[PDB]
Design a protein around this ligand. Structure first.
Ligand code: A1AIL
Length: 472
């Protein structure tokens, strides 16, 4: 009887739009917390400290103390025991600290904790930890909202994000920074899950698509904000503070939004449900049918396809969250990137969807994985002088993976007995959040050659997409 009550109280109108506006400004700043590791953990050019240079012909002094490296650069991990003045065999690891290049970034976490050379694996692990935190928090919060309400959990998760972010920028050692970020990730996962549930709960008939696409396009405008606030704030201790502070301001105003009116009925909190419904009626201005509500009415109210879908989400997480958290290897000008991604994404997603869906439902699913995977794979062959070509195939490569998110959120999930779709979209997101933890771990394989990470990162989407043609 709840849909009839919702029709009696509103639908579309004013409040159902104010609520949407009030819970999407925070989803731009959840994508400034996830992809900040391209600007707060960026490896600059690091050389070895020398007593000759850098105080107790600059070019000759640099050439005599540091042996030449393989990639046409001074060595980043070794120095000469004694100035080899024979240069008009014996090398010792750096023992006086590195010297970094401060020309685009002032202080990253790499600069402050020396996560270079031998201690290199720790950098692709500080992201897998965060994704594991998101995975854990998206599973714990599921069993903590059906008993504590759907609005209180969001309000407290805002405060948790704010406090954990404001604390994580003031730690003196790596292990604690790898734990407070875990807490931030769990709270962020809770925020996203509850925002989606609240967005759908209050809306009927006009929500099947529109509502769950508004969360996914808040991410695309969020990237453009990461680029901008990093063009501006350049340090790393003043970036986490500036990103985590707005969540406290969101927490204060989050005390006025009404709670879900469908959860209040199944628990017996009829009186407050009535208060919430009448309050919503006044904002919606449809104060004509609301006189009907007199407690009693609310008292009466109180396999192959499945496997194909999971593989598709796994491939989005593995490839996107591994190749996008190192946009320093897909080209240059990191600030210009992370902003063209969303601007490409929205026109690309809309235009690709409109044209391809007319071919068929399976064709759109197939062409949204093989195309970006092949675009990424065809990036190795390009020589490192057509930057427009190497960067363009990267921008368009990563942007087109963002249309797989949409073409498997609404257009798909019908490939089942078709009762209701909130059965398997949930199980799909478990895979995508678990392929992201098994994500940047592939980037640990930069040794044994450097082409292999990109090769795997392009092959996996291609095989996953080509397996979708085997539906029967
Ligand atoms: O929880 C989920 O949404 C399922 S996978 C996941 N886990 N953490 C995050 Br953030 N994401 C994310 C899932 C999907 C997107 C699509 C391209 C627009 C994201 C874009 C930017 C940052 C994170 C994203």
């Amino acid at each position: 009887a709840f849909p009839e009550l919702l029709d009696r109280v509103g639908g579309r109108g004013r409040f159902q739009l104010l609520q949407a506006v009030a819970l999407v400004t925070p989803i731009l700043w959840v994508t400034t917390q996830s992809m900040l590791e391209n600007f707060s953990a960026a490896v600059p050019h690091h050389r070895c400290w020398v007593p000759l240079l850098d105080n107790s012909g600059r070019d000759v002094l640099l050439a005599v103390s540091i042996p030449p490296g393989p990639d046409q650069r001074p060595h980043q991990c070794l120095r000469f025991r004694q100035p080899q003045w024979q240069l008009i065999a014996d090398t010792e690891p750096c023992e006086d600290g590195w010297v970094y290049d401060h020309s685009t970034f002032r202080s990253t976490i790499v600069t402050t904790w020396d996560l270079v050379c031998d201690s290199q694996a720790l950098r692709p692990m500080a992201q897998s930890i965060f994704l594991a935190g998101i995975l854990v928090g998206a599973a714990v919060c599921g069993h903590a909202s059906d008993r504590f309400g759907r609005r209180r959990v969001l309000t407290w998760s805002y405060l948790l994000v704010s406090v954990s972010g404001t604390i994580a920028a003031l730690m003196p050692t790596f292990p604690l920074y790898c734990l407070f970020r875990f807490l931030v990730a769990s709270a962020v996962a809770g925020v996203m899950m509850n925002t989606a549930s609240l967005l759908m709960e209050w809306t009927s008939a006009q929500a099947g698509p529109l509502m769950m696409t508004l969360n996914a396009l808040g991410f695309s405008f969020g990237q453009v904000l990461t680029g901008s606030v990093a063009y501006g704030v350049r340090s790393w201790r003043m970036l986490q503070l500036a990103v985590s502070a707005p969540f406290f301001l969101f927490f204060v105003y989050s005390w006025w939004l009404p709670e879900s009116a469908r959860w209040l009925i199944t628990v017996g909190r009829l009186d407050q449900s009535l208060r919430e419904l009448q309050r919503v009626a006044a904002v919606n201005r449809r104060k004509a049918e609301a006189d009907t509500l007199t407690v009693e009415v609310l008292r009466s109210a109180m396999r192959l396809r499945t496997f194909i879908s999971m593989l598709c989400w796994f491939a989005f997480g593995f490839t996107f969250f591994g190749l996008a958290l190192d946009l320093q290897a897909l080209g240059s000008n990191i600030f210009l990137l992370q902003a063209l991604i969303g601007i490409v994404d929205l026109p690309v997603k809309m235009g690709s969807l409109l044209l391809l869906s007319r071919l068929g439902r399976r064709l759109c699913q197939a062409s949204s994985l093989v195309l970006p995977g092949l675009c990424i794979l065809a990036n190795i062959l390009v020589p490192r002088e057509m930057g427009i070509l190497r960067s363009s195939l990267a921008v368009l490569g990563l942007g087109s993976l963002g249309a797989a998110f949409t073409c498997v959120t609404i257009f798909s999930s019908e490939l089942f007995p078709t009762v209701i779709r909130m059965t398997a979209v949930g199980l799909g997101q478990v895979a995508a959040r678990g392929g992201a933890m098994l994500g940047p771990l592939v980037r640990l394989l930069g040794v044994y050659g450097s082409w292999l990470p990109l090769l795997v990162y392009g092959v996996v989407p291609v095989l996953s997409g080509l397996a979708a043609l085997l539906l029967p």
